[PDB]
């Protein structure tokens, strides 16, 4: 299911009309917003769509021992891969960082202080930019997009090395707990299915009793 | 079925020709209209297309005990997910809030009083805007669209956290009522099917009796 | 079958080349025409394509008791959903009302009397409009299209609340008549099928008798 | 089969390159031509592609009683639905009436007499129109297309109400003739099939006799 | 098979790059060429692709009685429907007649004699036309295309009425010859199939004898 | 297989970037090249892809009687239909003859001698043509393309009448040789298949013997 | 699985918006970055998605003999083919080397020193290039892209000859270790499957015991 | 498999961005490079993807008799058909020879010596060509592309006649070696399959022994 989740997240980002309020202060709270909030939403949706969550909540409510811990630490990892993809693609595109850290790039060396902040804030994604002064247009876009793509590649490498270090090592892979978990997960589904079966059967008998009065 | 409902709602919004009556007063009653009425229509259609509704209405007409309450509080949740999607996408696009709260943005600081209201009302989605005075064009569009997308993300987060808090907690999940509900829902369908079967059989016998006179 | 009917009605409206005779009087009789006549045609086609209609007509010709009434009041509802969709989409597009009530909008306040009627009649869907005088062009289009879409949303809400109030309440849902109707509808089809079967068999025997003379 | 016939007729009209000989007299004999002749061709093709036609012709050649009449009055109705669709779409498009009744619209009030006829004949579908004199261009097109679409809607309503009045009423629906017709139609096909079967069998025997000399 | 033949003929005409040698005399021998030769080619290909042709030729070589005549008069009709479609579409498009009878239309009344012939020959499908003199450009195109489409409709009606008059009437439909023909056509195929079967079997035996020496 | 061969040849011609070396002498050796060499390549590929060729070569190497002759005269005909299609389409397009016989058309009557040859050689497929002198541009293109398409139609008619005259007449159709050929062609395939079968079986036994030492 | 990995890597490179920070020093650390880091990420993902990795890690943790070595040296080769494809396509496109070694090409012979470095750094992928001085634009692009494609072809040849030299020669192909590896790989999967089977069965028994109290 | 190889090679050539370093000397080493190296890579990949190669290498390592020779001379022919297709299409397009032999065409007769070499080297695929001097632009392109396509057709004919001369004649087609080869190729696959089977079975037994301790 997580595959359709990743594809849906990428396609949804392909359908989000990004645009920056070219204002001196609200930028830092919009780029980071688009960068962080949809990850949180997808990370919670990773818990909504799962089925074991009800059982785990019910068992954690009443005050086995560690198999619950493994189930939880496995569901978290299973759900964590959607926000990673979202952050990855939205850093590789670059519009987010261009929107966020536009009012801070060093104009003095690399490429009214309040008015300076105003213009540099107007820098990204606009044809309302003052223009030549203190920066060109395409230069401040290319610099920020390079920084963004570098952060994106570094982050993807970090997430991938964590994923590689988790699927080989110690974090709750002792075979006993694994077997107990698989047994529990099979038993719950078998119980639901067989209850549905016997319920349907008893209901069929009752309905045959009731119908034939006419 | 709710999946095809969500896809149909999104595609229908993709086929609704939005446009704003650039008038001083009717805006507040058009943006909010497009924002609120189609949600109500979809929320009622969530009850039309369902089948249990007839049984629930019939049982509630005559003056078990709580299983009806669970069936109702489950059907409501099942139907609630179409208006959420509609409001989400129509806030993320931004045309609705741009249409509604255009005659109120502070022109004095951020970016004839009656004439002022008239022009600021003409602001959105038009090439009939007065232009330079008291605001640019793209600035008042970007500001309002940023506000709209922020509200949209906040709302999606709110609906998702409610959905996550409901599918794990107390609101009528005691196993007894759940089992009674599943039993009832299986019995109704089995009754309808078996009645159809025996009716077809008796009819076949009667028809074989009637036909062979020729 | 009604689903393909709704899709066909919408697609047919997508293939009807609308255009307004920019004349002082014929408008009111063209917008309303396109709005009302195709609904009537689709509502009658809802009776043509149905099969029970022959039986109902035959039984109503000779001067059970109420099961006919239920069959009729059910077929009417089954057929009513095509004109609703047609009126809905042709009000949401807006060209119909723009064509109809163009010669009446108040030019004095909101946005030769005979010549005035002539021009305001020429208003919609034309590049032959006089222009600046007494109205702009895009303003009288936007105002009328807003009115049209408001009427459309109100109408869709009205039809949907009627549909929701019918599929839960009193109008001939007493189980006895429902069962009698289902029995009748199964018996008619079973009779036709079995008559076809026995007829084919007797014909096969006769044909085997006739053929083998050569 | 009639469904593919209707779709083929509509698609063929979508592939007929209409154009008007802008001449004073030949118009009336070209619009009406395109309007009437292809209906006749399709109405005859409705008899070619049918199979019962041979039997009916053979039985009518020699000088039961009324079952032939029902078969004929049913085949006619079955074939009549292609020209209806053709006339419907070619009136809704409007080019036919624009081509035909262009040399007659009243130029004096609504919107050398011989030269007048010549120009008004040149009116439709041309950029060789004289222009301003006695009419505009788009006005005489819109007026005629409105008239055409009105005739088209009226005609579709007429054909549909006839179709609804036929499939419920008296015209040869007495069950005896209907049963005789169905019996005859099953017997003919069964005879052909079984003759083919026995012929193939006898031929197989003969061929096995002949082949094995080598 | 004739259906794929008709579709292939139409699509091939959709892929034939028509162009007229704007010369005084060769026109009459190019329009008629494109009009007549491909019909002959398709009419012969209707005999190539058929299988009965070999048998009929073989039986006609040596100097039953009339069943051969029916087989021939049926194969001819079966093959005749490709050139009809070709001529139909290539008259409805109109380029053929425009190319052929361009050097003959009456320039004097309706719309150096040698030079006149030269120009009128240059009339069709060219931007090298002299222009205003003695004719316009679009007028002589529209007139000829109208004539062509009229001939096309008349021809399609003629072919269709012949097809309708043949599939109901006298031309060799006496049941005896029909049955003999069907018997012959089944016997030939059964003979070929069964010979192939027994040949394969004897060959399998021989090959099993030969192979197992190794 | 020959169908996919014809389609592949046509599509390959649709992917051959034709262009003419506008030189006085090399033309005659380029048009004819593109016209003749790919036919030879396809005619040899008709022998490569066939399977009987090995058997026929092997039997012809050693110095029955006439069945080999029939197999050969049948394989040749089977392979001959690809170059026919290639020549047909590459004559109907016309670029080949336009490229070849461009330096020969009579400029004097119909439409430095060395310089004349040079220009007329430059005529086709170029915007480097001298222009007005002794010929226009589109005239010498249309004349040559008409000649090419006439040759193409004549050639297609010739090949089709040969194909029709071969599939009905004398060239080695005596039933004895035909039967011997079919028998031989079945026996070869049956031998190969059954040898493969018995070989696989003996190998399976041997492998089961060898494997189970471990 | 590696096929979908190669296709996904190529398509992902088709969706990476490359762009160069036209700066004097950061180039060398951006071209090489895009060239080297995604290969490392894909090479680690080649270990994540594989299943044997857990077993190999577990066995290597505790301090047979060489079969582990073969499994490892086979998994490495299996995973190595994604970075090869990535480097291949991103060298054949050429943007990487154009971005990296742009500040070094010899301007003096082939095609303020600090300012020279600045301009030559600005060379690639920009319309902000100084222009004529010391180099053209398209020349320094073509030269670098030729160098890049030459390196790409050389690298693809190198990787392919290594792949050909490995799949024929000595590196741990002794049949004993190969058989032991295949046995181990079959046994692990069979163990997992059969454990799942017996676990499901015991769970079904337990659930049937538990359910039927109601 | 070789079919997908040919299609992949052609499509890959459709995705190789060709471009010429317009330099006096490197051309001869770039056209020939693109012409020759990818053929070598594909010819080696024809050995990588094959499976028999391991067996042949293993048997050739230790110092039957001639069946190995036939297997080798068959695998070589099987793999040789990808570079043929590559060279064919990359000669028919013409860019390769245009890139290679551009600095050599005789400018004196047909169409500073160092500067002459420089310009003629700049000739192909550039809009940086000096222009009129000593050659036009399109002429030197057409001449070289004609030469290239002539070489391409000659080469395709050569490869096809070799392929036709090999699949009919002497090169190791004696039936004994062919049968031995087919036997060997069946035995190897049967051995691998049956070993896998028995290994899976023994492993299943062992795993059933091990699992049921819990």
Give the other-Cβ count within 10 Å of A20's Cβ: 25
Q: Report the candidate in D153, D139, D47, D140 with the shortest Cα–Cα distance to residue D93.
A: D153
Q: Are E37 and E31 in contact (CB under 8 A)?
A: no
- Is A87 in contact with A134 (CB distance < 8 Å)? no
- Residue from F122, F31, F17, F20 nearest H146 by CA: F20
Q: Phi/psi zone of residue F17: left (φ > 0), alpha (ψ -120 to 50 degrees), beta?
A: beta
Q: CA of G211: which chain A residue's CA is closest?
A: A195
Give me the DSSP letters along chain D. Answer: -HHHHHHHHHHHHTT--------TTTTHHHHHHHHHHHHHHHHHHHHHS-SHHHHHHHHHH----SHHHHHHHHHHHHHTHHHHHHHHHHHHH-HHHHHHTTS-S-TTTT--HHHHHHHHHH-TT-S----SSSS-SHHHHHHHHHHHHHHHHHHHHHHHHHHHHHTTSSTT--HHHHHHHHHHHHHHHHHHHHHHHHHHHHHHHHHHHHHTT-
CA distance F53 to chain H (A): 7
List Cα–Cα distances, A100 to A144, A182, B3, B175, in angstroms. 10, 45, 36, 50
User: Torsion over CA of A72, A74, A76 and A80, rounded to 10 degrees?
Assistant: 180
Q: How far is A60 from chain B (nearest CA, A)?
A: 11
> Which whole-number Å values give the CA distances from C151 to C34, C93, C110, G214, H12, in the listed order?
16, 11, 19, 56, 58
For chain F, list the strands marked E by DSSP: none
Decide if D54 and E136 are in contact by the 8 Å CB cutoff.
Answer: no
- Do the Cβ atoms of C14 and B15 come closer than 8 Å? no
d(CA E146, CA D33): 11
Report long-range pairs for D206-213 (Cβ below 8 Å, ≥24 apart).
D206/E187, D207/E187, D207/E190, D207/E191, D207/E194, D208/E194, D210/E191, D211/E191, D211/E194, D211/E195, D211/E198, D212/E198
The alpha-helical segments, DSSP class H, found in G49-112 are: 52-61, 67-79, 81-93, 95-100
- Measured between alpha carbons, how far apart are the two ends of chain C, in Å? 48
The CA distance from F98 to the nearest CA of chain E, in Å, is 14
* Distance from C-alpha of F99 to C-alpha of F144, rounded to nearest angstrom: 9
Collect all residues with Cβ–Cβ distance below 8 Å to G146 and sequence separation of at least 6.
Answer: H19, H20, H21, H26, H30
Provide the 8-state DSSP code for C160.
H
CA B176 to chain CA centroid, Å, is 31
Q: Are the Cβ atoms of B164 and A48 closer than 8 angstroms?
A: yes
- What is the full DSSP assignment across F99-141? HHTTS-S-TTTT--HHHHHHHHHH-TT-S----SSSS-SHHHH
Would you say G185 and H58 are in contact if contact means Cβ atoms under 8 Å apart?
no
Q: Which two tokens stand for residue A68?
A: 């619950």
What residues of D are in contact with residue E187 (Cβ under 8 Å)?
203, 206-207
Tracing tokens 């600021």 back to the chain, one arrives at B120
Pairwise CA distance, residues H87 & B47, whole Å: 67
Element (H, E) at E110: none
CA separation for the pair G71, G62 (Å, rounded): 17
Domain count, chain C: 1
How many C-alpha atoms does F98 have within 13 Å on its Cβ side?
Answer: 25
- Under DSSP, the state recorded for F207 is H
- The DSSP symbol for G135 reads S
Domain that holds residue F145: 1-214
DSSP secondary structure, chain B, as one string: -HHHHHHHHHHHHTT--------TTTTHHHHHHHHHHHHHHHHHHHHHS-SHHHHHHHHHH----SHHHHHHHHHHHHHTHHHHHHHHHHHHH-HHHHHHTTS-S-TTTT--HHHHHHHHHH-TT-S----SSSS-SHHHHHHHHHHHHHHHHHHHHHHHHHHHHHTTSSTT--HHHHHHHHHHHHHHHHHHHHHHHHHHHHHHHHHHHHHTT-
Q: Are B123 and B140 spatial neighbours (Cβ–Cβ below 8 Å)?
A: yes
Contact indicator for B139, A128 with CB cutoff of 8 Å: yes
Quote the minimal CA–CA distance from A103 to chain B in Å.
17
Contact B128, B52 (CB under 8 A): no
Instruction: Judge residue F205's burial from the number of C-beta atoms within 10 Å of its C-beta, 0-12 exposed, 13-18 middle, 19 or more buried.
Output: exposed
Is residue F58 helix, strand or coil?
A: helix
Q: Give the nearest partner residue to F182 out of E22, E47, E199, using CB atoms.
A: E199
Q: Can you give the three-state secondary structure of chain H, one letter per residue?
A: CHHHHHHHHHHHHCCCCCCCCCCCCCCHHHHHHHHHHHHHHHHHHHHHCCCHHHHHHHHHHCCCCCHHHHHHHHHHHHHCHHHHHHHHHHHHHCHHHHHHCCCCCCCCCCCCHHHHHHHHHHCCCCCCCCCCCCCCCHHHHHHHHHHHHHHHHHHHHHHHHHHHHHCCCCCCCCHHHHHHHHHHHHHHHHHHHHHHHHHHHHHHHHHHHHHCCC
Token digits of residue E62:
């040596």
CB contact under 8 A, C204 and D183: no
* Biggest CA-to-CA distance, chain F: 94
Q: How far apart are CA A29 and CA A103, in angstroms?
A: 12
Alpha helices in C94-174 (DSSP H): 95-100, 113-122, 138-166
Spatial contact of F153 and E31, defined as CB atoms under 8 Å apart: no
Distances (CA, A) of B100 to A203, B35, B113: 54, 10, 19
DSSP A196: H
Residues 6+ apart with CB under 8 A from B57: C168, C169
Supply A180's token pair: 């107990």
By the 8 A CB rule, do A97 and A91 touch?
Answer: yes
Contact B199 C186 (CB under 8 A): yes
Q: What is the resolution of this structure in A?
A: 3.6
Query: Which helix (H) or strand (E) is C87 found in, with range?
Result: helix C81-93
- CB distance D2 to D82 below 8 Å: yes
Q: Give backbone dihedrals phi and psi of B158, rounded to 5 degrees, phi first.
A: -65, -50
Q: What is the experimental method?
A: cryo-EM
**A157 CB near a chain G CB, below 8 Å?**
yes
| H or E segment to which residue A63 belongs | none
Contacts 24+ apart (CB under 8 A), G50-54: G50/G75, G50/G78, G50/G79, G52/G185, G52/G188, G53/A167, G53/A168, G54/A167, G54/A168, G54/A173
Q: Supply the angle between the helices F2-13 and F28-48 in degrees, to the nearest 10.
A: 150
The packing angle between helices G28-48 and A138-166, to 10°, is: 30
Tokens 């050909």, located at residue:
G164
Return the residue of A nearest to G32 by Cα: A150
Rounded distance, CA B122 to CA B134, Å?
13
Q: H106 burial class (0-12, 13-18, 19+ CB within 10 angstroms)?
A: exposed
**E178 three-state secondary structure:** helix
Judge: E33–F153 Cβ closer than 8 Å, yes or no.
yes
> How close is the nearest chain B Cα to the Cα of A168, in Å?
31
CA E87, CA E10: separation in Å to the nearest integer?
10
What's the CA gap between F161 and F154, in Å, rounded?
11
Contact flag A41-B160 (C-beta cutoff 8 Å): yes
User: Rounded distance, CA F126 to CA F22, Å?
Assistant: 8
Which residues, 6+ apart, have CB-to-CB distance to F213 below 8 Å? none
| Distance of alpha carbon D98 from alpha carbon D93, whole angstroms | 10
How far is residue C102's CA from residue D69's CA, in Å, rounded to a whole number? 55
**H:75-114 residues touching chain F, CB 8 A cutoff:** 92-94, 110
Which of E34, E203, E212 to substitute to test the interface with F, most F CBs within 10 Å? Answer: E203
Nearest CA in chain F to E56: F168
Torsion of CA D119, D123, D127, D131, to 10 degrees: 60
- Distant-in-sequence, close-in-space partners of B178: CB < 8 Å, separation ≥ 6: B70
Alpha carbons B21 and B100: distance in angstroms, whole number: 10
Distance CA B196, CA C94 (A): 46
**d(Cα B99, Cα B96) in Å, to the nearest integer?**
5
Measured between CB atoms, which of A153, A163, A187 is closest to G207?
Answer: A187
Distances (CA, A) of H149 to D170, F20, F90, H139, H156: 78, 11, 16, 15, 10
Distance, in Å, from the CA atom of C80 to the CA atom of D72, rounded to the nearest integer, reads 34
Q: How many CB atoms lie within 10 A of CB C121?
A: 21
List of chain B residues whose C-beta atoms are within 8 Å of the C-beta of residue C160: 41, 44-45, 48
**Alpha carbon of B214: minimum distance to chain A alpha carbons (Å):** 30
> Is D126 in contact with E137 (CB distance < 8 Å)?
no
The SS3 assignment for E18 reads: coil
CA C136 to chain centre: 35
The candidate with the shortest Cα–Cα distance to H130, out of H146, H143, H117, H142, is H117
* Angle, in degrees to the nearest 10, between helices F175-211 and H175-211: 40
Q: Is H194:F205 a contact under the CB 8 Å cutoff?
A: no
> Would you say D121 and D103 are in contact if contact means Cβ atoms under 8 Å apart?
yes
CA B37/CA G211 separation, integer angstroms: 47
List CB contacts of F144: < 8 A, sequence separation 6 or more: F94, F97, F98, F101, F102, F105, F124
CB within 8 Å: C208 and D194:
yes
Angle between helix axes G175-211 and H175-211 (nearest 10 degrees) is 40
Residue C164 sits at the chain B interface (C-beta within 8 Å): yes
Residues F153 and E37: beta-carbon distance below 8 Å: yes
Q: Do chains B and H touch (3 or more CB pairs under 8 A)?
A: no
Is F200 in Cβ contact with H190 (below 8 Å)? yes
> Minimal CA–CA distance to G135: which of G95, G108, G96?
G108
CB-based contact B47 C164, cutoff 8 Å = yes
Cβ(D79)–Cβ(D50) below 8 Å: yes
Residues of chain C contacting D13 with CB distance shorter than 8 Å: none
Distance between CA atoms of A55 and C169, rounded to whole angstroms?
39
Q: Are residues A168 and G54, on separate chains, in Cβ contact within 8 Å? A: yes
Question: Which residues from chain B sit within 8 angstroms of residue A34, using beta carbons?
Answer: 153
- Tell me if H80 sits within 8 A of H72, measured CB to CB: no
Full DSSP string of E113-173: HHHHHHHHHH-TT-S----SSSS-SHHHHHHHHHHHHHHHHHHHHHHHHHHHHHTTSSTT-
Residues of chain D found within 8 Å of residue E143, distances taken between Cβ atoms: 21, 23
Residues C199, D182: C-beta atoms closer than 8 Å:
yes
Shortest Cα–Cα distance, C130 to chain B (Å): 18
Round to whole Å and give the CA distance between F90 and F97. 9
State the nearest Cα–Cα gap between F2 and chain E, in angstroms: 14
Q: Which residue has the tokens 């899976």?
A: H200
Nearest to E186 among D41, D203, D208 (CB): D203
CB atoms within 10 A of CB E209: 9
- Tell me which DSSP letter residue G85 carries: H
Read off the tokens for C112.
């030769």
Instruction: Report the C-alpha gap between E78 and E5 in whole angstroms.
Output: 11
Which of B24, B21, B143 is CA-nearest to residue B94?
Answer: B143
Handedness of CA A165, A169, A171, A175 (dihedral sign): positive
C-beta separation of F6 from F86 below 8 A = no
Cβ separation G199–A186 shorter than 8 A: yes
Which residues of chain F have a CB within 8 Å of the CB of H156? 41
Q: Do H20 and G143 touch (CB under 8 A)?
A: no
């Amino acid at each position: 299911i997580c595959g359709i989740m990743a594809l849906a997240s990428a396609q949804l980002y392909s359908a989000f009309d990004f645009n920056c309020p070219c204002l001196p202060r609200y930028n830092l709270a919009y780029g980071l917003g688009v960068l962080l909030v949809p990850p949180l939403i997808l990370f919670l949706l990773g818990f909504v769509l799962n089925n074991n969550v009800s059982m785990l909540a019910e068992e954690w409510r009443r005050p086995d021992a560690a198999v619950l811990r493994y189930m939880f630490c496995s569901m978290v990892q299973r759900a964590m891969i959607a926000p990673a993809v979202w952050v990855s693609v939205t850093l590789l595109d670059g519009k987010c960082i261009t929107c966020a850290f536009c009012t801070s790039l060093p104009v003095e060396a690399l490429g009214p202080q309040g008015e300076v902040k105003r213009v540099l804030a107007r820098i990204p994604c606009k044809e309302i930019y003052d223009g030549q002064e203190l920066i060109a247009n395409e230069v401040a876009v290319r610099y920020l997009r390079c920084i963004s793509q570098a952060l994106g590649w570094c982050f993807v490498l970090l997430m991938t090395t964590l994923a590689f270090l988790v699927r080989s090592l110690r974090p709750c892979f002792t075979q006993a707990v694994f077997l107990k978990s698989r047994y529990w997960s099979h038993y719950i589904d078998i119980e639901r299915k067989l209850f549905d079966e016997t319920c349907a059967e008893h209901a069929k008998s009752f309905a045959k009793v009731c119908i034939q009065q006419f």
